Design a protein around this ligand. Structure first.
Ligand SMILES: Cc1cc2nc3c(=O)[nH]c(=O)nc-3n(C[C@H](O)[C@H](O)[C@H](O)COP(=O)(O)OP(=O)(O)OC[C@H]3O[C@@H](n4cnc5c(N)ncnc54)[C@H](O)[C@@H]3O)c2cc1C
Ligand SMILES: Cc1cc2nc3c(=O)[nH]c(=O)nc-3n(C[C@H](O)[C@H](O)[C@H](O)COP(=O)(O)OP(=O)(O)OC[C@H]3O[C@@H](n4cnc5c(N)ncnc54)[C@H](O)[C@@H]3O)c2cc1C
Lengths: 482, 482
């Protein structure tokens, strides 16, 4: 009660913003949704509607990971009697065209879907004038629009190190999936899931990545599982530069990139030449252009703190997805929080988003999926002596004939030691990690216990059945290799 | 412990028998385990210890399915820009050799493990003298041993139709996996999972199968899903002879096999020529050679009815696995039941086998996995108006670039309509169906409801997350294709 141009304005058109805008209209709101994509500096990469996942995230990364797995499949096929040739090579440019052809088909479908659902899509950059007023800057011109409620869904963009040559000579994941030039010998700075997945499918597509790690691999993940993923990448011939930080990048006369770098423990300074330098050193939330102080919204560095209803400290302004402080930065999380948020606003729902036990997958050459607590978090939370860890190495049926290493085929269930022996966390390295873990995440939400887990009849022959076969505890001290 | 040569004699060295034998010795019993493999009649195929799964079942079937899938991966790789050659053909002799090579390694490790664990392995055919005495026929002489307790775990062997030429010219799954000659053009008589799987990998390896179906496809399975499986195989060039039954087989001068057959609906008589006739029309329990009347054990046709502790009507004699009457005939069922039985006999356990909601996968070219009730059984049991079926067609991310048909990529959830909305059944046709369904099967055993299902965050991008995206009910009559 007051009267504005819209019930709801959503700022940002990626996973959360669009899910939110669509669910809001379904429930009868009058809604606008702004989306705009700043081109990468140098290179100037830009793209269509639908945000990070579709354009420069989950989707192209999965497709290139598939490109890399298919190469290996071609190699294994010979072991099974197929008369395949060995000297096979990927055309990078055909790969990139395929992937970009897919993404642009998706951009169109999404654009049509919005218009069909009557979501008013504005292609401009929104900034607050006040807690109820937004200026949209359009390709040419501006509109000032009001709303009862604002959902901030602006996400982030890749960070650049504060080092000479960084922006002129390096790229990020924004550039990588449409790179005009072949990656070639590549330096991947950062050992979060993005850097690892990148290095992984670079090696698999015939290039030469090296991963540079400042301190640890996959911070926020179970560190045993982390180190197993890193060693499995080294087994695949991907070198790692541990405890090492970039100093500078310069272009040589021959067009090669000379990177000087520094070991952070020893102080040792080194250099090497690469064709490509990929920064995968984190993503910074896009609060900057919002002019949040005009709106009264408090900020926590580059992110926005929200209550369990995704409200900011300003009662009418909400934020959802990646710009939000301290929550899983993942697509299905953005989508579902976006939608639920529209449903409480307009569909009379009280269902709040559940952020606990979110499953995830790192799509490394051998993939790592997990849901729930890491081993160390459970131990910190409850005490070593109130925790049980069941573990083992296993052998995929599909690995024997081609003789593929099973050295890093390992899984573990982290659980309550007594009582109901509640399962806290599940971790798996191996083929189709995410396909395996998804149903187990649903089980953890239904209260999975160790007794149920271990008495769920296996589907044979699968690697998923290895979770139901778990029996050796770390406490027993018994060899986890059957 | 007192009077007999053994605490325990296990008759049958397959999935149930070995799991029973091993667990029994772990709990201090003195055990022998008999295994003997009768050679196939004609042809005379025979193999080592470990039973059907290892030698003529799950394992070779999974390996040849993998060979067929790798063939498809090779063709897909090109869509992603790999410069692979199109004209590839598998070598059957090389494939059989790699499969048999794996199975002989496993036979030997299994034998070694039995000795290491002190299970006394006797390669001889057991028949009862009385309820405490067994005669063992060895290659050499005969033994005659006594025990306090017997576990019958003899399983089954494929059936032959009672039809001229059947045994002289036909083969079964027992011969297939080490066929000396190339299948060629093959009539697969029977449309259970064994027939369909064999037909599927044979087509995938360059041969020309035809499936002959007496009545229905996949009797015992959700029939909607059965028809989608059949049609996905017709999509791949595999024909079905519907409502059709074999009459005879003869060998022509040119070495081919003339099959006379009859449509049982129209009465039509037809014939055709094949290189191979695979009978996949069921398996008969091996009660015959046991001389059960000597033990006083009651049988139910070819099977043995047992109570919920796997006991026969003779209290010192149990049966477990495929020979048992009326239970799922699958490897992990046999393994877990034989384990739990030994653990109750000797381990002071009271835990009984749970035969309900066992998950299974049909490893057809597009795999069908399921757990819990088919739609028709849920409707039968509860009423249409108490059932909600959530369903959808979906598109695997990996299918886009090579433009693979998504026509049969379909899943559904059969659920309680009101109340807690307990999930009764899950069904999925698509890639890595068994990897997807396994965790969901543990979810079901934990009480998975629709609310849990639909609010478990997806792992993106996966096909497994399609389960958590389910939203369109059959009752709405809305299009299940987004
Ligand atoms: C390489 C990489 C791999 C990933 N892999 C996975 C994975 O496999 N699985 C998974 O779940 N997640 C993955 N993610 C994470 C996932 O893509 C993000 O979690 C998700 O896209 C976040 O959605 P969002 O709506 O918050 O932000 P975004 O999708 O980034 O959308 C925000 C949109 O708003 C625009 N915008 C910003 N400011 C304004 C403004 N002032 N006005 C108008 N528009 C604005 C932005 O330009 C952008 O288009 C990956 C991310 C990266 C980069
Ligand atoms: C082609 C095919 C595909 C299959 N695919 C799958 C699948 O992928 N997944 C799955 O879970 N299951 C699968 N199975 C089913 C699975 O193989 C069986 O359920 C399982 O092997 C049954 O185990 P068992 O111990 O009861 O029998 P077995 O493995 O058959 O029995 C063991 C043995 O007892 C021996 N024996 C019999 N009589 C005597 C006697 N009197 N004295 C001494 N020894 C005797 C037999 O010769 C045999 O070695 C498949 C089966 C077939 C045939």
């Amino acid at each position: 009660q007051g009267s504005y141009d819209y019930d709801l304005i959503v700022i940002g058109g990626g996973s959360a913003g669009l899910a939110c805008a669509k669910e809001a209209v379904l429930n009868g709101a009058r809604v606008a949704c702004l989306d705009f994509v700043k081109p990468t500096p140098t290179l100037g990469t830009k793209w269509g509607v639908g945000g990070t996942c579709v354009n420069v995230g989950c989707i192209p990364k999965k497709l290139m990971h598939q490109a890399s797995l298919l190469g290996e499949a071609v190699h294994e096929a010979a072991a099974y009697g197929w008369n395949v040739d060995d000297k096979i090579k990927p055309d990078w440019h055909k790969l990139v065209q395929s992937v970009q052809n897919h993404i642009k088909s998706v951009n169109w479908v999404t654009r049509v879907d919005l218009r069909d659902k009557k979501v008013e899509y504005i292609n401009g950059l929104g900034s607050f004038v006040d807690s109820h007023t937004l200026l949209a800057k359009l390709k040419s011109g501006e509109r000032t629009i009001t709303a009862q409620t604002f959902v901030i869904a602006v996400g982030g963009r890749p960070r650049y190190p504060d080092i000479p040559g960084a922006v002129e000579y390096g790229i990020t994941s924004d550039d990588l999936f449409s790179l005009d030039r072949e990656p070639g010998k590549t330096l991947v700075v950062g050992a979060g899931y993005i850097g690892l997945e990148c290095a992984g499918f670079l090696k698999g597509l015939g290039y030469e990545p090296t991963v540079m790690v400042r301190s640890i691999v996959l911070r926020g993940f179970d560190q045993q599982m982390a180190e197993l993923v890193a060693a499995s990448m080294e087994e695949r011939g991907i070198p790692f530069l541990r405890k090492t930080v970039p100093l500078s990048v310069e272009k040589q006369d021959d067009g090669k990139l000379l990177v000087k770098y520094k070991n952070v423990e020893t102080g040792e300074e080194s250099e090497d030449v690469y064709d490509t330098v990929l920064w995968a050193i984190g993503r910074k939330g896009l609060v900057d252009d919002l002019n949040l102080p005009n709106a009264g919204v408090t900020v926590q560095k580059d992110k926005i703190p929200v209550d369990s209803q995704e409200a900011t400290n300003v009662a009418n302004i909400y934020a959802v997805g990646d710009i939000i402080y301290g929550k899983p930065e993942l697509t299905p999380v953005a989508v579902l929080a976006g939608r639920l948020l529209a449903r409480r606003l307009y569909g009379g729902s009280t269902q709040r988003m559940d952020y606990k036990d979110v499953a995830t997958t790192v799509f490394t050459p051998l993939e790592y999926a997990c849901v729930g607590l890491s081993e160390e978090d459970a131990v910190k939370q409850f005490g070593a002596d109130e925790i049980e860890v069941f573990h083992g190495y296993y052998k995929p049926t599909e690995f024997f004939i081609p003789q593929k290493s099973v050295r890093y085929c390992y899984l573990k269930a982290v659980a309550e030691r007594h009582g109901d022996q509640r399962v806290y966390g599940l971790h798996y390295i191996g083929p189709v990690a995410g396909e395996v873990i998804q149903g187990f995440a649903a089980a953890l939400k239904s209260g999975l216990t160790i007794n149920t887990l271990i008495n769920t009849v296996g589907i044979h022959p699968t690697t998923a059945e290895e979770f139901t076969r778990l029996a050796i505890t770390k406490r027993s001290g018994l060899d986890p290799t059957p």
